[PDB]
């Protein structure tokens, strides 16, 4: 009994999912992670954490992400973040607290009894009992056929149909729970293999493994997945199953049992399962290819020796005084590598941009904080193109609802690049920041 307590203590100390449960900001993190799986992740996490001060932002988000990566909650391959089984387990536990489909049903008992009978019949090697069981089943089927031909077609009740639908959905949707587990097992097997190779470096083992074309990364989960997908490759029963499901879906009791998302999930079981099964073979192939490429490099002995030397240096580094500037600035002995030259031998595009102009005009309006007409705005911010700007200001004024007067004229003199003069007979406008502060552009 105490062994259970010790194991619980160890699990609380170690398992990353429980640590995520114990995290203070678990709700936001879980919401973000669940939404994403349906670099930029840091952006989304910071944006979500923004309007949740209550109770840095970028720095704290990065620190949390790196801590979780160190905790192996998520993995990083080249530039992308990928999930593990623990994330899905935690998500399931969290969202299961709302509503759970009951299993203690008579229909489940019937299915269990049928499966038990099937197992007991299948495991028997006797050639006589199987024949007797087949005869009994045929006799029972003939009795049922005679009773049906007597006019006793049995139609189940409403509650019975609802319970059957719910149980079928519950049992069917559980096929996709083990996918990440196989990938995690393959990754950990690959890491163990690389550690063994580097620890060993012996070239004979590398040559033998490269010569051998046998599949590496052998785990029982791989064999189970292979058998499952091999039986899944037979579409003959898949078509019948899909047709039966689509026939079932057209029943008046459906809206009373399953919501829209459940019906959508049930409608496309077969193709989705096939595609998901296919999606793992590419990952296995890439893992094997990367392992073989790493083996062909033949630098394991080099890395082993350099690691040993670095460990020796870092062991020596604990016997020096880093509190002295003179010692820290004492030159060492390292030849110059990659020495460059000694500096010298000692001898109608572009057009117009709108966003920048809008932002600068907004900044001027907010900094001045007073009504401004077109003349002053032109003076403070001389334009490159005289047109395409007056129109923009007038459009902003009209859209914002700020009134524009046309009975009076303001004369603005502009000079282009090639000298000369132009005069604009603009009407009068007054621009303020407060009115237009809440309109997108």
């Amino acid at each position: 009994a105490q062994q259970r307590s010790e194991r619980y203590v160890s699990a609380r100390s170690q398992h990353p999912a429980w640590l995520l449960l114990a995290s203070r900001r678990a709700p936001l993190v879980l919401g973000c992670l669940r939404t994403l799986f349906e670099e930029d992740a840091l952006q989304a996490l910071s944006e979500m954490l923004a309007a949740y001060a209550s109770q840095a932002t970028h720095l704290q988000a990065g620190r949390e992400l790196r801590e979780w990566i160190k905790r192996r909650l998520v993995v990083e391959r080249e530039g992308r973040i990928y999930a593990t089984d623990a994330l899905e387990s935690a998500i399931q536990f969290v969202d299961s607290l709302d509503s759970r489909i009951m299993t203690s049903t008579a229909s489940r008992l019937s299915v269990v009894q049928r499966e038990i009978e099937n197992l007991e019949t299948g495991l028997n090697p006797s050639p006589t009992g199987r024949i007797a069981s087949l005869r009994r089943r045929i006799q029972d089927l003939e009795h049922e056929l005679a009773r049906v031909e007597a006019g006793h077609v049995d139609v189940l009740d409403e509650a019975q149909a609802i319970e059957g639908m719910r149980e079928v959905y519950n049992l069917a949707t559980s096929l996709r729970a083990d996918f990440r587990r196989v990938e995690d097992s393959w990754r950990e097997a690959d890491r163990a293999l690389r550690h063994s190779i580097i620890s060993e470096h012996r070239g004979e083992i590398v040559d033998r493994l490269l010569d051998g074309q046998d599949a590496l990364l052998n785990t029982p989960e791989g064999r189970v997945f292979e058998s499952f997908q091999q039986q899944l490759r037979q579409s003959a029963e898949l078509e019948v199953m899909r047709e039966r499901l689509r026939t079932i879906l057209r029943h008046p009791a459906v809206p009373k049992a399953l919501n829209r998302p459940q019906q959508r999930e049930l409608r496309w079981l077969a193709l989705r399962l096939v595609r998901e099964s296919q999606a793992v073979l590419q990952a296995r192939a890439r893992s094997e290819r990367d392992v073989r490429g790493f083996m062909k490099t033949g630098l394991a002995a080099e890395h082993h020796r350099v690691g040993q030397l670095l460990n020796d240096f870092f062991n020596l580094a604990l016997s020096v005084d880093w509190q002295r500037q003179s010692e820290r600035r004492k030159p060492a002995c390292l030849p110059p590598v990659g020495v460059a030259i000694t500096g010298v031998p000692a001898i109608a595009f572009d057009g117009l941009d709108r966003e920048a102009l809008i932002h600068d005009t907004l900044a001027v309006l907010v900094e001045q904080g007073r009504p401004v007409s077109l003349g002053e705005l032109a003076s403070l911010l001389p334009p490159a193109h005289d047109l395409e700007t007056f129109a923009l200001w007038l459009a902003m004024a009209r859209e914002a609802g700020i009134e524009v007067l046309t009975e009076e004229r303001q004369f603005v003199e502009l000079v282009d690049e090639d000298e000369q003069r132009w005069g604009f007979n603009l009407p009068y406008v007054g621009l303020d920041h407060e009115a237009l502060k809440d309109i997108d552009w």
Binding site: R398, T406, P427
Partner: peptide, 30 residues
């Protein structure tokens, strides 16, 4: 094409609509 327009034009009329109403404004240059 406002760049080419400015070469061979001497006036402009801007039409803007807000809500279900519209309005016109006149300009010039020289």
């Amino acid at each position: 094409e406002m760049r080419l327009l400015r070469h061979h034009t001497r006036s402009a009329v801007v039409v803007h609509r807000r809500g279900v109403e519209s309005s016109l404004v006149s300009l010039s240059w020289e």
